[PDB]
Each structure stands twice: as C-alpha cells, then as structure tokens.
Design a protein around this ligand. Structure first.
Ligand SMILES: *[C@@H]1O[C@H](CO)[C@@H](O)[C@H](O)[C@H]1NC(C)=O
Ligand SMILES: *[C@@H]1O[C@H](CO)[C@@H](O)[C@H](O)[C@H]1NC(C)=O
Ligand SMILES: [Cl-]
Ligand SMILES: [Cl-]
Ligand SMILES: [Cl-]
Ligand SMILES: [Cl-]
Ligand code: NA
Ligand code: NA
Ligand code: NA
Ligand code: NA
Lengths: 355, 355
C-alpha cells in the first residue's frame, strides 16, 4: 500500500554526506502514468550553514535514517477520494538530500565536506526506473514542491532529453512545479545575508550556485552572460525557454517568498508601507504568470500544496487543482480550464484558502 | 449532483401506455466518456400479463410518476470512491418502460393496448444526446443490467451503425452486459408457462418476440431460420456475431435464471438431483464464456451488479470488476486481466460473494 524505499545502485551518486541517495516507489501495473515527485526543504549555501543543517535536519543531507516505507499523500495518494483523476499512477517520491535545489551535477571535490548531486540523483532514479516499468510509460510527470518545484524547472528538459537519448522517445515528459516560482525581488527591509532566513533571493542563489557547482538548463543558460546563471533559478526567467510542458502551481503570497523578503504576516494589523509591498508582490507574481498557459495561482498565504491531503479543497474561479491538471493533460493529448490565476489583492481574498 | 430527467421530444416513441419515454442525464464536460445504462425489470409476453404488470409495476410501463432526478449508483456514480476509474463520465440512465427486453421497433398497432418500442427508445435517446455533448464523445459504453443486459446484446451493433450513419464514426461504441446472459435450458421441474415466473426461457421468448414484434441483430438473425429469431435473445448465440466489443458480467448462478428454471436456493439442504442440476448449470455457463475475451463471472448466487453501490467489493482470481473494466478499455485502445471466470462448483465457493 505504501511506497517502498530503494537505495540507488550507482555508488557515485549520493546524498550530501555520501550515503546512498534513493527513491520510494509504488508500482501500478495497470497504468502507464508515472508521477516522479521531488521533495523540497530549502538549501544551504556555504559549509557553516550546511554544517548546521546537518546537525538539525540530517534527513535532508543523509539517507542513514530514512524509513523503509512512506504513505503517498495528495497527488501521490492511491486513494480515489484523495486523488480523483490520478490515484492509479505509478508513484515515486524522491527524497531531497542534496541541499542544492536539485542543481548539483558534479562528484564531490576533495576540498568539500559535502557532495551536491541533486541533478544526478534525478538522472540515476530515471535510469533505475526504466528497469521497473517506466520503459512502458505514456506520461512521466516530474512534479515537485518548494525547492522541488524549482528543481522541476531546472531538470524537466534534462529528463526529456535523457529518455530520448536512452531510446524511449514515446514517453511524454512533462512538469508540475508547485511553490517553486519565486521573484528575485528586494526585501521589504534589509537583513545581511548570513543564512537562508536572512539572505535575499538573488544573493542566496548567487552564492549557492557557486558553492554547489549547480547547473541550469542549457536553453536558459544561453540567455544570460557567463557567471549570471543564477537567473535561471527564477521561474519567470527559465520558463519561457522550456521545451517540455510545465504546469505552474503558485500561491500568490508564498510563505517562503515572504520569509526571504523579511515579511511575517500573522494576522496582525500592518502599516501602509507593508500593505503596499505585499499588494505589489501579488501583482508582480500575477504579471509573471500572464503568459504561462497552464497555471493555478490562488490568492492565499501558504506554501506547498500537491502532496497535502487537502489539495482537493482550494478552488480558483470555480475549479479545483486536480481538475485543472486533468484539463491540462487532456489539452496536451471546452468547459475545462487550465489557466486559473486570482486577481484579488490580499491573501485570503479567495474564500477557499487553507486555514 | 443527480441525473436529471428529460422526456423524449419525438412523440412517436413512447412507453407501453403511450406516455413519453425518456432518460436521465448528468453531464460531465471534462470527459469524453459516455455511459448509457439500460434498466432491467423482466418483461410481459401477453396482454393479460402486461395488464397485471400495469396494475402492480406501473413504473415499468409508464413515465407518469417518474421522479425528476435520480442519484447515480455503482458505475453511474460520480463519486471516486464508488466508481474509481469512471466517476467522471457523462452518465445516462434510460428507464425501462417497454416490457420487451428492449427489442420492440414498431409503432403500436390499433389491435394492441400497449406499444413496445424499446429499440426505438434507445435510438431516440442517442439522437437527442448528440445535441447534448455526445457528438464529442470518444467512447460510448452501452451498459445494462438483467433485461437491460440482454438489451445491450440486442442493440449495441444497431447503436454503432446509427452513429456512423449520422456522421460520427470516431465515437467508439462498446457494450457492457450485466446479468443478461441466459441459458435456453430445461427447467429442473416443469411448470406450465402462464407468467414470467413459471415460463421456461425458450417459451417465454418465443411468445414474447411475437407479441412485441421484437427485432434482433441482423448478424444473428441470419444464422437462424425464419421464425427462429428467439435464439438471438440468448447471449451465447448472439455474441459470436457481434461487431462491437462487449464485456460480459454474469453471476454463474443467476437468481433470474434459477427462477425460470424453477429452482429456489435459500440456504436449505438440497437433494442430490437438484445439486447435480445446479452444478451442471454453472458448468454450462462457464462453457459459454470460454471464448468471450472480456468477462467477469463469479461463482455466486445473485442478480445484477453494475449499478449496485457495492459493485467494487467482489473479486475473481484477485481482481475487481471496475479494474477488469479498466483493463478491457486499455486493451481496446501486462498485469491487467480481462477474462475472469470462476471454476469452482457451487454458489459462494468464491469468498467475496455479496451476502
Ligand atoms: C552513474 O552515475 C553517473 C552520474 O550520474 C553517470 O554519469 C554514470 O553514467 C552512471 N553509471 C551507470 C552505470 O549508470
Ligand atoms: C422519431 O422516431 C422514429 C422511430 O424511432 C424515427 O424513425 C424518426 O426518424 C424519429 N424522428 C425524428 C425527427 O427524429
Ligand atoms: Cl489497474
Ligand atoms: Cl562543503
Ligand atoms: Cl473534469
Ligand atoms: Cl397489447
Ligand atoms: Na527573512
Ligand atoms: Na479574479
Ligand atoms: Na419459476
Ligand atoms: Na478457478
């Protein structure tokens, strides 16, 4: 009933500490649909901060204590009531143990404590799954939440290419990026960049990319000058050059965006300046989605949705996320919308927001 | 949420008493799948017996008191937990008001009290649905239980032809016949044919066909001599010449078959002769399904299944009916069986039978 853990067979490809990376799998032999989900969980952008992460959030840097099984939730649930359209898919959860926003593509240097291999983890999972049924797939949906969402944007075209090169051109590779669409904006009030809470988005990725030896998609890399590849971690910059179809799910007021912007909305009264900052951030997010054909962007203050059990409950313009996703799937193959962006100005202006 | 009643616009096509026939409809604009379900409810084969039926089961002869709405159940449910694969289909329930096993194709004669138009009801429903979305369909599944099941066998190729003639050759017409697969066998002990309870199966249909002016499929009609069209109401005789794919669901020990065979199994001890009769009936039913590629035939004493809420619960050889149906749908488009026939000798030898 649960997804079962498999540790990768390729010993070169590891979590930060060198323990084997892996994936959880629940096979569904009556379906040709595969859902490959990339876990989120922030990042670390220097050795001091990765050392702290290792001490406090070891599961995000090591496979040593991963459980043998995981129950799928939300889009990974095999229960029809929880996942009405896609419950019968082949379900894969790839734990995030690379701290690199799934962008690392090099073996560890002798001058590093940690290895940053997230892009290679994805590649190796895909290769091992080919011997487990993925060879027969019709659709491979690379999905992800938060850092995993950004990971989808960074890896979907790599995966697409990989399957073609390996001899499986009929598998349709698509992406689903949830809560991974950020603005490289100015903080409301500044804090010096010392950790992931205090570091403005541009600065965090400029530092991170270098530390991780992170790679970005080739089609986006071209658009920016040498040393300016950090741009490609920002959805509105990377999205227009993608080859693969990607559906974008994004809360207009994402809690992680607010955190790195040094805004904390807790149900307190706010001053006009903060009001304006927050309203403008929602407008800016809307602006970036105007030409994204397949999107779901409710006016709520939240973070992540697709593996949450109550992902069926939020609606935009009268339509749920699972339905919008189904409509998109059909469009890629009347009364079935795929572009669903709220336009009201403040979080919870949509009555269906999670509470 | 419910299916809503529509009375047919074609005034020539009526229930037994001349009231308008009709259909219940729940549209699902995000699906190209249509389920058209034919209700069962025995038959009447002369005026005396139809008069009694009118007095005691008027709903089966008249639309006068039909409710404005009906909740879909089983395969007609829009609830994922109840109908895991096909909950999102366009749902149509066609009430049985013709008492003719859906075989009547003539206007009423002035020498009759009742009109027998069941084949024409189906045709007229299909024509009216074309203006309601069916024009866009990918799959039209003509399904039915008991008399409706036999109705599927009698009408599926007519429907197929009809859609082609009307200019919609891309719609894939298929059938699902539940509890409509009977043997034209000898009664265990004889009773004179005076009503539907006492009349042996051959005699019932020989009488009925004539009374109804019933029509049978052309491909089967050819196989039998003039006046021997009654043969075509028996699945094992009509099935081999069908053009359309038909999935057959049949309890090995169908309660209606036993009734017309003058057997009543109620959990009492039975004599060896009755034991042998019942065992042979199961063997015979098995024999008739050996070359039916898509079938689900559990060793249970029951009648009907596909619109029952607990249709998900019975299993044969480890597989449920909704799954077998999904596997068949995929086959028509490994680890996905479609031919599922029990081989044990007595009802309830399958532990999953309904209780
Ligand atoms: C092992 O992983 C590395 C990096 O992803 C890759 O280049 C190599 O092809 C893999 N080896 C095998 C045998 O799959
Ligand atoms: C009315 O129904 C009759 C019998 O089914 C049929 O022959 C005729 O074509 C129908 N008329 C219309 C206008 O659909
Ligand atoms: Cl299945
Ligand atoms: Cl390091
Ligand atoms: Cl839909
Ligand atoms: Cl009559
Ligand atoms: Na902050
Ligand atoms: Na709006
Ligand atoms: Na009887
Ligand atoms: Na068996």
């Amino acid at each position: 009933e649960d997804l079962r853990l498999h540790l990768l067979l390729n010993t070169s490809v590891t979590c930060n500490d060198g323990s084997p990376a892996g994936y959880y799998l629940k096979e569904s032999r009556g379906s040709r649909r595969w859902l490959l989900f990339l876990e989120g969980g922030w990042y670390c952008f220097n050795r001091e901060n990765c050392d702290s992460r290792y001490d406090t959030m070891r599961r995000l840097m090591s496979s040593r204590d991963w459980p043998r099984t995981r129950t799928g939730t939300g889009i990974l649930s095999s229960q029809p009531e929880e996942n009405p359209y896609w419950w019968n898919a082949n379900m894969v959860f790839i734990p995030y143990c690379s701290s690199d926003v799934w962008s690392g593509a090099s073996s560890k240097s002798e001058k590093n404590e940690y290895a940053f291999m997230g892009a290679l983890i994805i590649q190796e999972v895909v290769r091992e799954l080919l011997g487990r049924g993925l060879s027969g797939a019709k659709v491979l949906l690379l999905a992800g939440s938060a850092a995993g969402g950004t990971g989808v944007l960074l890896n979907v075209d790599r995966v697409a290419e990989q399957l073609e090169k390996l001899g499986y051109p009929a598998i349709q590779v698509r992406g689903l990026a949830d809560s991974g669409w950020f603005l490289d904006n100015k903080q409301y009030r500044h804090t010096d960049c010392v950790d992931t809470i205090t570091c403005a988005p541009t600065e965090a990725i400029r530092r991170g990319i270098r530390y991780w030896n992170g790679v970005v998609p080739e089609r986006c890399r071209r658009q920016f000058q040498e040393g300016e590849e950090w741009n490609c971690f920002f959805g509105y910059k990377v999205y227009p050059t993608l080859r693969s179809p990607v559906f974008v799910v994004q809360w207009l007021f994402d809690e992680a965006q607010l955190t790195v912007d040094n805004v904390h909305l807790t149900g307190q009264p706010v001053q006009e300046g903060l009001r304006l900052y927050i309203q403008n951030l929602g407008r800016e997010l809307r602006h970036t989605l105007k030409d994204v054909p397949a999107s779901f962007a409710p006016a709520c203050l939240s973070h992540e949705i697709i593996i949450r059990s109550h992902w069926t409950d939020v609606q935009v313009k009268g339509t749920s996320l699972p339905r919008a996703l189904h409509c998109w799937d059909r469009s890629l193959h009347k009364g079935c919308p795929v572009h669903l962006v709220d336009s009201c100005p403040w979080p919870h202006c949509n009555p269906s927001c999670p509470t």
